[PDB]
Amino acid sequence: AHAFWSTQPVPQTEDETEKIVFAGPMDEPKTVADIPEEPYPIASTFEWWTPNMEAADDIHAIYELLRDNYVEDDDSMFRFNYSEEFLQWALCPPNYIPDWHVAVRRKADKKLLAFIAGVPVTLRMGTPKYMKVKAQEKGEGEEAAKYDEPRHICEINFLCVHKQLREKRLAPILIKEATRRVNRTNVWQAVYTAGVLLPTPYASGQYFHRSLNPEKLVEIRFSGIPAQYQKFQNPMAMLKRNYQLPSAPKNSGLREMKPSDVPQVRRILMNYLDSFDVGPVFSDAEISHYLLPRDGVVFTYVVENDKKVTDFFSFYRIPSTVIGNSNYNLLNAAYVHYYAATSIPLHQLILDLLIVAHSRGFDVCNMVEILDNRSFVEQLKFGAGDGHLRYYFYNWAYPKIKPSQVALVML
Ligand SMILES: CCCCCCCCCCCCCC(=O)SCCNC(=O)CCNC(=O)[C@H](O)C(C)(C)COP(=O)(O)OP(=O)(O)OC[C@H]1O[C@@H](n2cnc3c(N)ncnc32)[C@H](O)[C@@H]1OP(=O)(O)O
Ligand SMILES: CN(C)CCCN(C)c1nc(N(C)CCC#N)c2sccc2n1
Ligand SMILES: [Mg+2]
Question: Structural domain boundaries of the chain?
Answer without folding.
Answer: 1-411
